[PDB]
Amino acid sequence: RQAXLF
Amino acid sequence: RQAXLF
Amino acid sequence: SHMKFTVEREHLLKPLQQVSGPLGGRPTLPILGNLLLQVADGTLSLTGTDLEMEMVARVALVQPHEPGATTVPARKFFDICRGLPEGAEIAVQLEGERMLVRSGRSRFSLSTLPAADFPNLDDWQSEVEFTLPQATMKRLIEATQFSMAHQDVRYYLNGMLFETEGEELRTVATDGHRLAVCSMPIGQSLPSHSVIVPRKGVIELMRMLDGGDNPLRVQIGSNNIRAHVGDFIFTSKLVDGRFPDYRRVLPKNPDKHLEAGCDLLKQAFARAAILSNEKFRGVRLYVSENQLKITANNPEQEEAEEILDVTYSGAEMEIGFNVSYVLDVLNALKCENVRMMLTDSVSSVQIEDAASQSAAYVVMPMRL
Amino acid sequence: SHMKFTVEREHLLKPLQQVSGPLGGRPTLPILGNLLLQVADGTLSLTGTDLEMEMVARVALVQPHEPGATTVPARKFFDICRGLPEGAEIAVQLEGERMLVRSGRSRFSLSTLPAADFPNLDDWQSEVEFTLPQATMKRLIEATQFSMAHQDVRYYLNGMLFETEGEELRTVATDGHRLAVCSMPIGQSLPSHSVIVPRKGVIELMRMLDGGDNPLRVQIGSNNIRAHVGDFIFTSKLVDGRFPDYRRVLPKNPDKHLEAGCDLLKQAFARAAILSNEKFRGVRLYVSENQLKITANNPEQEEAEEILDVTYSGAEMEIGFNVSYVLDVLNALKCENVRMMLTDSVSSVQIEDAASQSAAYVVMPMRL
Ligand SMILES: [Cl-]
Ligand SMILES: [Cl-]
C-alpha cells in the first residue's frame, strides 16, 4: 500500500 | 452525394 | 456598433494562439468555444476563457478601425489566419450577425455569438504585486508541476501553492503521496501571502512564458491571480482551502544520506520500472555501504535488478517506492549528482540536487 | 536446447524496433505480443508477426553463443535494451522458462512463451523477383498510399496493387471515390504480374525503408510477397480479389485543362476546407477563363470563398468535390505547378504534376 505524507 | 469511380 | 479592423497576419497569430489556451473542453455554454474580439480606442482586445480563467491579448490598431465587439469560433478564426500567406493583411468586419474575414481574394463569413453573452471574470482588486523574470517563473513551475494531484477529492491539491515570503517566491505541489517545493529570490520585499492556482491555470501560466526578456508582472487578490507578459494578460480564479505546510512534511532528521549520479540513478529506475507492476509501480530500494540495489517484480513474476555504486555510509535498510514518483523527481532535477536523505522503511525520503537547495522533493514510500 | 548469445546494444536496437512493427493490435493469441528469438549456426534471428505478415531481422553472432529458441515480450525486451547505456554488451540466455537479460550490474528476468507456438507463415515459392532502390519503392508507396480504402467491404480496396509491366513497377490505390497510380522504371524486364498487398503490409514496407543505399529485393509468389532490405526480411500474405483497372478509371477525353501553382491551390483548398461540412467536406469549384473560384459552406451557413488566377481556356463549369480528397492529392504532389483535367460536373477529374506523368490522380466529384 502507498503511504500518505499526512 | 459522393459519386463512385464505377 | 460596427466593429472593423485591419491587422497584419503576424500581429494576430501568436495572440490568437495564446487566447485560445483555455478552450478545448467538453461543449457546455456555446460562447466558450469563441474568442471575444473588442475594438476600443486604438486597441483590439482578444479574450478566450473557460469560466475559471481567461487569457487576453491586446493588439495595437495602427490601420483604420471602428469600435465594437463580437465573438467568433476560436479554432476556425485561428485556422483562417494561420492558413493565409505570410504578410497577409487580415481585414475583419462585422456584417449583421456575421464576422467577415478578408485577405487578398479569400473571403470568410463566420457565425458569431453576442459579446454581451461573453463571460467576464468578476471585478477584483489586487492585494499583492511583484515583477519577475519569466525564467524564474518557468523554473518554479517546472520544478513542482508534476507533483500536483489530478482530480483529488481535496480540490486544493489539484493546483499549486504560490507563496511569497521575504524576498522569495515559492511553489509547492503535492498529492499527499509525494511533494515538490521550489523557492527563488525575486529581488524585492514581499508580504507573506499564499494562494492556490488551479492546475489548468498553472499550465496556462507556463504556456504564456515565451522565453524572451519581457518580465512577468503578477497581481494577487483575495480570489484571483493575474499575470501580465508583454501584451498578454492571464487571469484565473484561485482555489479555496488550506494547502498543507511543506515545512511540516520535510523529513525532520534524516539519519541516512545517499549520493549518486542523477543520470545513472534515473536510467536504473527507468529500466527497473519496465518490470514493475503496471498499476502499482512498486520498486524496492536496498541501501548498503556505498551501494544502492533497486528491484522490481510484476504479476508475471518478471524481475529487474539494478545495482549502483553510490556514496552511502548509514545503516542498511530496505524501502519500497512507486517508481513513477521517483522518476518524476529525477527527471525534474536534471543535474550531475542527486542526494537522497532517508530515515527508515515507513518514512518519507527527501531528494534534491546535491549542488542546490532551491528545490526539494519528498516522496512517501509504499509498504513493499 | 539452451539458447544464449551476447550482442552489443546498437547491433540489437534497430532490429528490435523493426521486428516490432507488426505488433500492437488488440490482445488475441498471447504469443503475438512476443518476438521469436532463434540462435542457429552464427545467426540470431528475431521475428515479429500479426499472422498476416512478419518481419525478421538476422543478426550475425560474433561472440560466444549456443543455439535454441524462445519468445519474449516485445515491448519489455525492446525497452530493456533501449534503456541500457550506449555500448552496453547485452548477454541473453534462457534459464528454464525465463529469459535472462544481463548487462553491467542490470539483470532482467522475462517470461517466455514456447518457440513451438510461434506462428510461421506457410511455405511458398516466389514466381517473380526484382531488385530496386529503396527511394523508388518509397516514391511509389508515398505517391498512392493515401487513396487506399480503410475497412471497405471490398477487402481488395484495403490494400495497394503492386503491378510489374515491361520494365516498370506500378502502384495503384483506390477506395472507389478517388484513385492514385504511380509507375516507375526499375531497369529490368519483368513478367506482367499484379498483387494486392494489405494496407498494414504497405505501411510495414514503408517503415523498413531506412533511406540508405541497401537495395530492396522483392519476391512475389501466388499468395505472398517478401521484401529484403539489408538484414531485414518482411513477408506478407496477399489479398485475394480482382482489383479495378486504373486504365479504365482514367478520364477518357478531358476537354478542359486547368493549370495552377500547387502551393497556391493547396493553401486555397486548405483554407476553404475550414468552412466545409465537417462530415461531408464538400467544396464547389467554379472554373472560368483563367480563374478558379472555390466555395465552402457548412451547416452553420458559414462560407469560405477563394479566387485564384489559373491557366484555363475551356468552357465555364461548376463541380463539387470532397476537399479532403483534393487536399490529399495536392499534398502528395509537392511540385511547382499542377494540371487538372476535367470533362463535366458529374465526371471524374484527373490531377497531376504539370512537369511529370509518373503519378496520376483521379477524384470523382460529389453532386454539389
Ligand atoms: Cl497591423
Ligand atoms: Cl556483437
Coordinates of N, CA, C and O in Angstrom, one line a residue, chain C residues 100-201:
Chain C
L100 N -16.9 38.9 -41.0 CA -16.2 38.7 -42.3 C -14.7 38.9 -42.1 O -14.2 39.8 -41.5
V101 N -14.0 37.9 -42.7 CA -12.5 37.9 -42.7 C -12.1 37.9 -44.2 O -12.6 37.1 -45.0
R102 N -11.3 39.0 -44.5 CA -10.9 39.1 -45.9 C -9.4 39.4 -46.0 O -8.9 40.2 -45.2
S103 N -8.8 38.8 -47.0 CA -7.4 39.0 -47.3 C -7.2 38.5 -48.7 O -7.6 37.4 -49.1
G104 N -6.6 39.4 -49.6 CA -6.4 39.1 -51.0 C -7.8 38.9 -51.6 O -8.7 39.7 -51.5
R105 N -7.9 37.7 -52.2 CA -9.3 37.3 -52.8 C -9.8 36.1 -52.0 O -10.4 35.2 -52.6
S106 N -9.5 36.0 -50.7 CA -10.0 35.0 -49.8 C -11.1 35.7 -49.0 O -10.8 36.8 -48.5
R107 N -12.3 35.1 -48.8 CA -13.3 35.7 -48.0 C -13.9 34.7 -47.1 O -14.3 33.6 -47.6
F108 N -14.0 35.0 -45.8 CA -14.6 34.0 -44.9 C -15.7 34.7 -44.1 O -15.5 35.7 -43.6
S109 N -16.9 34.1 -44.1 CA -18.1 34.5 -43.3 C -18.2 33.6 -42.1 O -18.6 32.4 -42.3
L110 N -18.0 34.1 -40.9 CA -18.1 33.3 -39.7 C -19.4 33.6 -38.9 O -19.8 34.8 -38.9
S111 N -19.9 32.6 -38.2 CA -21.1 32.9 -37.3 C -20.5 33.5 -36.1 O -19.3 33.5 -35.8
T112 N -21.4 34.2 -35.4 CA -20.9 35.0 -34.2 C -21.9 34.7 -33.1 O -23.0 34.3 -33.3
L113 N -21.5 34.9 -31.8 CA -22.4 34.9 -30.7 C -22.3 36.3 -30.0 O -21.2 36.9 -30.2
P114 N -23.3 36.9 -29.5 CA -23.2 38.3 -29.0 C -22.1 38.5 -27.9 O -21.9 37.6 -27.0
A115 N -21.4 39.6 -28.0 CA -20.4 40.0 -27.0 C -21.0 40.1 -25.6 O -20.3 39.8 -24.6
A116 N -22.3 40.5 -25.5 CA -23.0 40.7 -24.2 C -23.1 39.3 -23.5 O -23.2 39.3 -22.2
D117 N -23.0 38.2 -24.2 CA -23.1 36.9 -23.5 C -21.7 36.4 -23.1 O -21.7 35.3 -22.6
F118 N -20.6 37.1 -23.4 CA -19.3 36.5 -23.1 C -19.0 36.6 -21.6 O -19.2 37.6 -21.0
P119 N -18.5 35.5 -21.0 CA -18.3 35.5 -19.6 C -17.0 36.3 -19.2 O -15.9 36.0 -19.6
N120 N -17.2 37.3 -18.4 CA -16.2 38.2 -17.8 C -16.0 37.8 -16.4 O -16.9 37.7 -15.6
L121 N -14.7 37.6 -16.0 CA -14.4 37.3 -14.6 C -14.8 38.6 -13.7 O -14.6 39.7 -14.2
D122 N -15.4 38.3 -12.6 CA -15.9 39.4 -11.7 C -14.9 40.4 -11.3 O -13.7 40.0 -11.3
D123 N -15.3 41.6 -10.9 CA -14.4 42.7 -10.5 C -13.6 42.3 -9.2 O -14.2 41.7 -8.4
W124 N -12.3 42.7 -9.2 CA -11.5 42.4 -8.0 C -10.3 43.4 -8.0 O -9.9 43.9 -9.0
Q125 N -9.8 43.6 -6.8 CA -8.6 44.4 -6.6 C -7.5 43.6 -6.0 O -7.7 42.7 -5.2
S126 N -6.3 43.8 -6.5 CA -5.1 43.1 -6.1 C -4.7 43.6 -4.7 O -4.8 44.8 -4.4
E127 N -4.1 42.7 -3.9 CA -3.6 43.0 -2.6 C -2.0 42.9 -2.6 O -1.4 43.4 -1.8
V128 N -1.5 42.1 -3.6 CA 0.0 41.9 -3.7 C 0.3 42.0 -5.2 O -0.4 41.6 -6.1
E129 N 1.5 42.6 -5.5 CA 2.0 42.7 -6.8 C 3.5 42.6 -6.8 O 4.2 43.0 -5.9
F130 N 4.1 41.9 -7.8 CA 5.6 41.8 -8.0 C 5.9 41.5 -9.4 O 5.1 40.9 -10.1
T131 N 7.1 41.8 -9.9 CA 7.5 41.6 -11.3 C 8.8 40.8 -11.2 O 9.7 41.0 -10.4
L132 N 8.8 39.7 -12.0 CA 10.0 38.8 -12.0 C 10.3 38.3 -13.4 O 9.5 38.3 -14.3
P133 N 11.5 37.8 -13.6 CA 11.8 37.2 -15.0 C 11.0 36.0 -15.3 O 10.7 35.2 -14.4
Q134 N 10.6 35.8 -16.5 CA 9.8 34.6 -17.0 C 10.6 33.4 -16.6 O 9.9 32.4 -16.3
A135 N 11.9 33.4 -16.8 CA 12.7 32.2 -16.5 C 12.6 31.7 -15.0 O 12.7 30.5 -14.8
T136 N 12.4 32.7 -14.1 CA 12.2 32.3 -12.7 C 10.9 31.7 -12.5 O 10.9 30.6 -11.8
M137 N 9.8 32.2 -13.1 CA 8.5 31.6 -13.0 C 8.5 30.2 -13.7 O 7.9 29.3 -13.1
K138 N 9.2 30.1 -14.8 CA 9.3 28.8 -15.5 C 10.0 27.8 -14.6 O 9.5 26.7 -14.4
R139 N 11.1 28.2 -14.0 CA 11.9 27.3 -13.1 C 11.0 26.8 -11.9 O 11.0 25.7 -11.7
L140 N 10.2 27.7 -11.3 CA 9.3 27.4 -10.2 C 8.3 26.4 -10.5 O 8.0 25.5 -9.8
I141 N 7.6 26.6 -11.7 CA 6.5 25.8 -12.1 C 7.1 24.4 -12.6 O 6.6 23.4 -12.1
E142 N 8.1 24.4 -13.4 CA 8.6 23.1 -13.9 C 9.2 22.3 -12.8 O 9.2 21.1 -12.9
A143 N 9.8 22.9 -11.8 CA 10.4 22.2 -10.7 C 9.3 21.4 -9.9 O 9.6 20.5 -9.2
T144 N 8.0 21.9 -9.9 CA 7.0 21.3 -9.0 C 5.7 20.8 -9.6 O 4.9 20.1 -8.9
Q145 N 5.3 21.3 -10.9 CA 4.0 20.9 -11.5 C 3.7 19.5 -11.5 O 2.5 19.1 -11.3
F146 N 4.6 18.6 -11.8 CA 4.4 17.1 -11.8 C 3.8 16.5 -10.5 O 3.3 15.4 -10.5
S147 N 4.0 17.2 -9.3 CA 3.6 16.7 -8.0 C 2.2 17.1 -7.6 O 1.7 16.6 -6.6
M148 N 1.5 17.9 -8.4 CA 0.1 18.3 -8.2 C -0.8 17.1 -8.3 O -0.5 16.2 -9.1
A149 N -1.9 17.0 -7.6 CA -2.8 15.9 -7.8 C -3.6 16.2 -9.0 O -3.7 17.3 -9.5
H150 N -4.3 15.2 -9.5 CA -5.2 15.2 -10.6 C -6.6 14.7 -10.1 O -6.7 13.6 -9.6
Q151 N -7.6 15.6 -10.0 CA -8.9 15.3 -9.5 C -9.0 14.6 -8.1 O -9.8 13.7 -7.9
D152 N -8.1 15.0 -7.2 CA -8.3 14.6 -5.8 C -9.5 15.2 -5.2 O -9.8 16.3 -5.5
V153 N -10.2 14.5 -4.3 CA -11.4 15.0 -3.6 C -11.0 16.3 -2.9 O -11.8 17.3 -2.9
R154 N -9.8 16.4 -2.3 CA -9.2 17.6 -1.7 C -8.8 18.5 -2.9 O -7.7 18.5 -3.3
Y155 N -9.8 19.3 -3.4 CA -9.6 20.2 -4.5 C -8.5 21.1 -4.5 O -7.9 21.5 -5.5
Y156 N -8.0 21.5 -3.2 CA -6.9 22.3 -3.0 C -5.6 21.6 -3.5 O -4.6 22.3 -3.7
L157 N -5.6 20.3 -3.6 CA -4.4 19.6 -4.1 C -4.3 19.5 -5.7 O -3.2 19.3 -6.2
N158 N -5.4 19.8 -6.4 CA -5.4 19.9 -7.9 C -5.0 21.3 -8.3 O -5.7 22.0 -9.1
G159 N -3.9 21.7 -7.8 CA -3.4 23.1 -8.0 C -2.0 23.2 -7.4 O -1.4 22.2 -6.9
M160 N -1.5 24.4 -7.5 CA -0.1 24.7 -7.0 C -0.2 25.9 -6.1 O -0.8 26.9 -6.4
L161 N 0.5 25.7 -4.9 CA 0.6 26.8 -4.0 C 1.6 27.8 -4.5 O 2.7 27.3 -4.8
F162 N 1.3 29.1 -4.5 CA 2.3 30.1 -4.9 C 2.4 30.9 -3.6 O 1.4 31.4 -3.1
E163 N 3.6 31.0 -3.0 CA 3.8 31.7 -1.8 C 4.9 32.7 -1.9 O 6.0 32.4 -2.4
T164 N 4.7 33.9 -1.3 CA 5.7 35.0 -1.3 C 6.1 35.0 0.2 O 5.2 35.0 1.1
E165 N 7.4 35.1 0.5 CA 7.9 35.2 1.9 C 9.2 35.9 1.8 O 10.1 35.4 1.2
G166 N 9.3 37.1 2.4 CA 10.6 37.8 2.4 C 10.8 38.3 1.0 O 10.0 39.0 0.5
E167 N 11.9 37.9 0.4 CA 12.2 38.3 -1.0 C 12.1 37.0 -1.9 O 12.5 37.1 -3.0
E168 N 11.5 36.0 -1.4 CA 11.3 34.7 -2.2 C 9.9 34.4 -2.7 O 9.0 34.7 -2.0
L169 N 9.8 33.9 -3.9 CA 8.6 33.4 -4.4 C 8.8 31.8 -4.4 O 9.8 31.3 -4.7
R170 N 7.8 31.1 -4.0 CA 7.9 29.7 -3.8 C 6.7 29.0 -4.3 O 5.6 29.5 -4.2
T171 N 6.9 27.8 -4.9 CA 5.8 26.9 -5.3 C 5.8 25.6 -4.6 O 6.9 25.2 -4.3
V172 N 4.6 25.1 -4.3 CA 4.5 23.9 -3.7 C 3.4 23.1 -4.4 O 2.3 23.6 -4.6
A173 N 3.7 21.8 -4.7 CA 2.7 20.9 -5.2 C 2.8 19.6 -4.5 O 3.9 19.1 -4.2
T174 N 1.7 19.0 -4.2 CA 1.6 17.7 -3.6 C 0.2 17.0 -3.8 O -0.8 17.7 -4.1
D175 N 0.2 15.7 -3.8 CA -1.0 14.9 -4.0 C -1.2 14.0 -2.7 O -2.0 13.1 -2.7
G176 N -0.4 14.3 -1.7 CA -0.4 13.6 -0.4 C 0.5 12.3 -0.4 O 0.6 11.7 0.7
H177 N 1.0 11.9 -1.6 CA 1.9 10.8 -1.6 C 3.4 11.3 -1.9 O 4.3 10.7 -1.3
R178 N 3.5 12.3 -2.7 CA 4.7 13.0 -3.0 C 4.5 14.5 -3.0 O 3.4 14.9 -3.1
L179 N 5.6 15.3 -2.7 CA 5.6 16.7 -2.6 C 6.8 17.3 -3.3 O 7.9 16.7 -3.2
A180 N 6.7 18.4 -3.9 CA 7.8 19.2 -4.6 C 7.6 20.6 -4.1 O 6.5 21.1 -4.0
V181 N 8.8 21.3 -3.8 CA 8.8 22.7 -3.3 C 9.9 23.3 -3.9 O 11.0 22.8 -3.9
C182 N 9.7 24.5 -4.5 CA 10.8 25.3 -5.1 C 10.7 26.7 -4.7 O 9.6 27.2 -4.6
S183 N 11.8 27.3 -4.3 CA 11.9 28.7 -3.8 C 12.9 29.5 -4.6 O 14.0 28.9 -4.9
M184 N 12.6 30.7 -5.0 CA 13.5 31.5 -5.8 C 13.5 33.0 -5.3 O 12.4 33.5 -5.1
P185 N 14.7 33.6 -5.1 CA 14.7 35.0 -4.7 C 14.2 35.9 -5.9 O 14.5 35.6 -7.1
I186 N 13.4 36.9 -5.6 CA 12.9 37.7 -6.7 C 13.2 39.2 -6.5 O 12.7 40.1 -7.2
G187 N 14.2 39.5 -5.7 CA 14.8 40.8 -5.6 C 13.9 42.0 -5.1 O 14.2 43.1 -5.5
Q188 N 12.9 41.7 -4.3 CA 12.0 42.7 -3.8 C 11.3 42.2 -2.5 O 11.0 41.0 -2.5
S189 N 11.1 43.1 -1.5 CA 10.4 42.7 -0.3 C 9.0 42.5 -0.5 O 8.3 43.3 -1.1
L190 N 8.5 41.3 -0.1 CA 7.1 40.9 -0.4 C 6.4 40.7 0.9 O 6.9 40.1 1.8
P191 N 5.0 40.9 0.9 CA 4.3 40.5 2.1 C 4.2 38.9 2.1 O 4.4 38.3 1.0
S192 N 3.9 38.3 3.2 CA 3.7 36.9 3.3 C 2.3 36.6 2.9 O 1.4 37.0 3.5
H193 N 2.2 35.9 1.7 CA 0.9 35.6 1.2 C 1.0 34.2 0.5 O 2.0 33.8 0.0
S194 N -0.1 33.5 0.5 CA -0.2 32.1 -0.1 C -1.5 32.0 -0.8 O -2.6 32.2 -0.2
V195 N -1.5 31.5 -2.1 CA -2.7 31.3 -2.9 C -2.5 30.0 -3.6 O -1.3 29.5 -3.8
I196 N -3.6 29.3 -3.9 CA -3.6 28.0 -4.7 C -4.1 28.4 -6.1 O -5.2 28.8 -6.2
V197 N -3.3 28.1 -7.1 CA -3.7 28.3 -8.5 C -4.2 27.0 -9.0 O -3.5 26.0 -8.9
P198 N -5.4 26.9 -9.7 CA -5.9 25.7 -10.3 C -4.9 25.1 -11.2 O -4.1 25.8 -11.9
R199 N -4.8 23.7 -11.3 CA -3.8 23.1 -12.2 C -3.9 23.5 -13.6 O -2.8 23.7 -14.2
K200 N -5.1 23.8 -14.2 CA -5.2 24.3 -15.5 C -4.6 25.7 -15.6 O -3.9 26.0 -16.6
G201 N -4.8 26.5 -14.6 CA -4.2 27.8 -14.6 C -2.7 27.8 -14.5 O -2.0 28.6 -15.1

